Amino acid sequence: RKDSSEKKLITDALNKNQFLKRLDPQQIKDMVECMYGRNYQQGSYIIKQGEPGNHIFVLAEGRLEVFQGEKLLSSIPMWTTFGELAILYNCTRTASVKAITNVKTWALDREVFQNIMRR
Ligand SMILES: Nc1ncnc2c1ncn2[C@@H]1O[C@@H]2COP(=O)(O)O[C@H]2[C@H]1O
Ligand SMILES: [Ca+2]
Numbered sequence: 001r002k003d004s005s006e007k008k009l010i011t012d013a014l015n016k017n018q019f020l021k022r023l024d025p026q027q028i029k030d031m032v033e034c035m036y037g038r039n040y041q042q043g044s045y046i047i048k049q050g051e052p053g054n055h056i057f058v059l060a061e062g063r064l065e066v067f068q069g070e071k072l073l074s075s076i077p078m079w080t081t082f083g084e085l086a087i088l089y090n091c092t093r094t095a096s097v098k099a100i101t102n103v104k105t106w107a108l109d110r111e112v113f114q115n116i117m118r119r
């Protein structure tokens with residue numbers, strides 16, 4: 001699915017996330033190899049506040065904004081991990097994440113994220 005170049009970009013994105021610094025390099029490597037590409041059209045939501053957390057994402061291309069309601073929280077820089085809170089802490093999505101342009105993410109599903117933690 002990915003060359004060494006993309007694997008390195010995703011790896012760095014995951015390693016920079018404060019809540020993921022706990023994981024071993026083997027766990028990160030496993031996440032990377034398992035991640036799958038998903039595109040989103042402009043104006044669609046990658047994440048909706050209040051939903052369960054079924055995926056963790058890395059922004060690979062395009063622009064994303066984080067919202068509570070109509071209120072803007074943050075612009076997600078390229079190669080940033082997001083959607084991790086609801087996964088790690090068994091909570092609901094804390095905010096919505098909207099596609100400001102057409103977007104590509106790398107995504108990992110929740111159960112896999114935990115199978116990897118079960119290795
Ligand atoms: N203030 C904020 N700034 C940047 N990102 C945020 C902020 N609040 C929430 N997020 C991100 O938005 C995501 C929405 O779903 P999660 O709660 O799973 O994980 C959340 C974080 O990755
Ligand atoms: Ca990150």
Ligand SMILES: [Co+2]
Nearest residue numbers: 038046054055
């Ligand atoms: Co979906």
Ligand SMILES: [Co+2]
Nearest residue numbers: 060061062078
């Ligand atoms: Co580009």
Ligand SMILES: [Co+2]
Nearest residue numbers: 061062063101
């Ligand atoms: Co762009």
